[PDB]
Amino acid sequence: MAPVQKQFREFHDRIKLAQYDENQTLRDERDAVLTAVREGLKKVFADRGEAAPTFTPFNQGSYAMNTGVKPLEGGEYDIDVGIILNIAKDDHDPVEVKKWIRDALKDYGNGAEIRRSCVTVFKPGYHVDLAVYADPELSGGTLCIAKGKENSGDEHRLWQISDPQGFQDRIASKLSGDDAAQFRRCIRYLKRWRDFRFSSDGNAAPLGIGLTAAAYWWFQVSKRTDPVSQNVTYDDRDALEQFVQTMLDNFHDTWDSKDQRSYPRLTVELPVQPYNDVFEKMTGMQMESFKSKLQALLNALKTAKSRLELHDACKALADHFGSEFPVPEK
Ligand SMILES: Nc1ccn([C@@H]2O[C@H](COP(=O)(O)OP(=O)(O)OP(=O)(O)O)[C@@H](O)[C@H]2O)c(=O)n1
Numbered sequence: 430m431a432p433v434q435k436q437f438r439e440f441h442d443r444i445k446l447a448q449y450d451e452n453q454t455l456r457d458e459r460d461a462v463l464t465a466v467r468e469g470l471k472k473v474f475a476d477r478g479e480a481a482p483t484f485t486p487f488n489q490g491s492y493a494m495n496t497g498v499k500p501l502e503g504g505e506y507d508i509d510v511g512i513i514l515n516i517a518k519d520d521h522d523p524v525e526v527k528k529w530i531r532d533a534l535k536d537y538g539n540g541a542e543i544r545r546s547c548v549t550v551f552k553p554g555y556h557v558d559l560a561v562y563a564d565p566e567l568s569g570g571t572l573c574i575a576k577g578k579e580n581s582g583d584e585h586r587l588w589q590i591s592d593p594q595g596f597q598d599r600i601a602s603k604l605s606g607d608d609a610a611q612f613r614r615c616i617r618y619l620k621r622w623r624d625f626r627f628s629s630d631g632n633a634a635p636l637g638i639g640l641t642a643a644a645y646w647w648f649q650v651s652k653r654t655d656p657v658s659q660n661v662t663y664d665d666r667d668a669l670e671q672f673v674q675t676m677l678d679n680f681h682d683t684w685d686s687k688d689q690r691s692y693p694r695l696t697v698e699l700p701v702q703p704y705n706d707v708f709e710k711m712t713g714m715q716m717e718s719f720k721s722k723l724q725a726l727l728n729a730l731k732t733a734k735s736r737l738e739l740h741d742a743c744k745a746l747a748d749h750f751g752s753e754f755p756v757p758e759k
């Protein structure tokens with residue numbers, strides 16, 4: 430066994446959250462919101478003189494991709510779902526259409542908010558992010574998401590080409606079997622690191638989709654095949670070291686004319702439509718802090734290879750992964 434592998438696998442077992450297909454609670458919470466939308470849409474379309482448009486829901490996000498983590502105490506579950514409205518995008522304003530969904534959910538939980546890229550509804554200990562799409566078959570064969578806020582300019586409210594099922598396929602398909610299992614474990618490790626070390630400043634935290642897209646570009650398996658048994662062992666500490674170092678290598682000093690200084694920026698393009706940099710909203714100063722903390726994590730991963738005393742190696746890692754990283758007693 431690779432150094433600290435037992436402790437990484439135990440850490441994974443503590444942080445992992447069962448995916449939608451294995452998680453009745455999440456399916457029930459998802460479905461309760463989809464039912465509230467269907468009921469709520471009846472009221473909204475009561476004064477329009479026609480039936481509410483129908484929609485086709487689909488699972489999105491980490492709970493669809495088997496990369497979900499449990500929140501830390503006081504954190505929330507992030508239930509991501511897509512709804513494809515039986516509407517032509519050319520007939521409707523994208524913020525108009527998100528208002529249907531917001532109004533439908535007005536009285537559900539702690540209420541609902543139009544965000545740039547979804548309508549979010551709040552419950553105790555979880556939120557549900559509904560991504561709202563027009564029907565491809567009515568919208569020129571394209572799947573487009575409703576972008577813009579109520580307080581957005583005409584240029585910022587748009588139906589944007591989006592490929593959530595292609596992204597989910599690219600994550601599922603990069604690797605297979607226990608190689609793909611290591612890939613998903615390493616995405617989860619970085620999400621717990623994110624939640625433990627980016628808790629001061631929420632909006633500074635690297636988005637889950639960005640960490641996932643970074644792993645899609647740059648993750649490499651680390652494993653060994655025993656020359657006698659051909660038994661395979663994985664080295665999650667090494668896989669994370671190489672991945673973290675590769676991320677650090679892709680930061681680029683980027684001049685900002687407004688501030689008259691450079692900030693180190695990591696660009697991570699989605700590998701499907703709309704091919705945007707998913708880290709674009711992070712400020713330069715937040716990027717600088719992200720790089721510094723990633724470098725500190727790299728240095729701890731290297732320390733965990735050298736310590737020899739298992740307690741010391743694991744303590745170095747728990748300083749970046751938090752209190753659920755197992756630290757054996759010396
Ligand atoms: N090609 C695209 C474009 C956008 N998204 C959006 O990305 C959302 C998920 O983003 P986020 O919640 O940050 O990522 P997760 O992988 O769910 O990470 P976490 O576990 O941290 O929530 C999805 O619901 C979807 O709307 C996507 O999945 N695929």
Ligand SMILES: [Mn+2]
Nearest residue numbers: 490491507509
């Ligand atoms: Mn999510």
Ligand SMILES: [Mn+2]
Nearest residue numbers: 507508509558
């Ligand atoms: Mn979300």
